[PDB]
């Protein structure tokens, strides 16, 4: 069970694409952030972004006060586990391949997604 992680904002300062120049592909070519790109390994049913937060991996923790059903990630593709669901809509997954990276597990084997989503400007307004 391996997620590959990418920094959301390595695909902007880089000016790649997410499945052109397969990012994740040709990061590997130069050598970013570790804490930014790089291939997650973690045991399945594990909750990804803790199996990746032991690591040094953080992310943008979207959890609002009363209950909560959206983080801040970009699944480059892959599916991943987690309780049960509604408010979420799959036109998000597909997209926006957003999902729930907290207490959410990867349900394939290598998965590819975005970390620090927060730094999409959906949301960069509403930071303050
Ligand atoms: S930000 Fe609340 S469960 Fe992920």
Not at 86 to 108: F, H, W, Y
């Amino acid at each position: 069970p391996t997620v590959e992680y990418l920094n959301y904002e390595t695909l902007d300062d880089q000016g790649w694409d997410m499945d052109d120049d397969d990012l994740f592909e040709k990061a590997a070519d130069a050598g970013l952030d570790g804490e930014d790109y790089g291939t997650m390994e973690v045991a399945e049913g594990e909750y990804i972004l803790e199996a990746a937060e032991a690591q040094g991996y953080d992310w943008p923790f979207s959890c609002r006060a009363g209950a909560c059903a959206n983080c801040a990630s970009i699944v480059k593709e892959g599916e991943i586990d987690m309780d049960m669901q509604q408010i979420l809509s799959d036109e998000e997954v597909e997209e926006k391949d957003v999902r729930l990276t907290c207490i959410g597990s990867p349900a394939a084997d290598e998965v590819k997604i975005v970390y620090n989503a927060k730094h999409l400007d959906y949301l960069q307004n509403r930071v303050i």
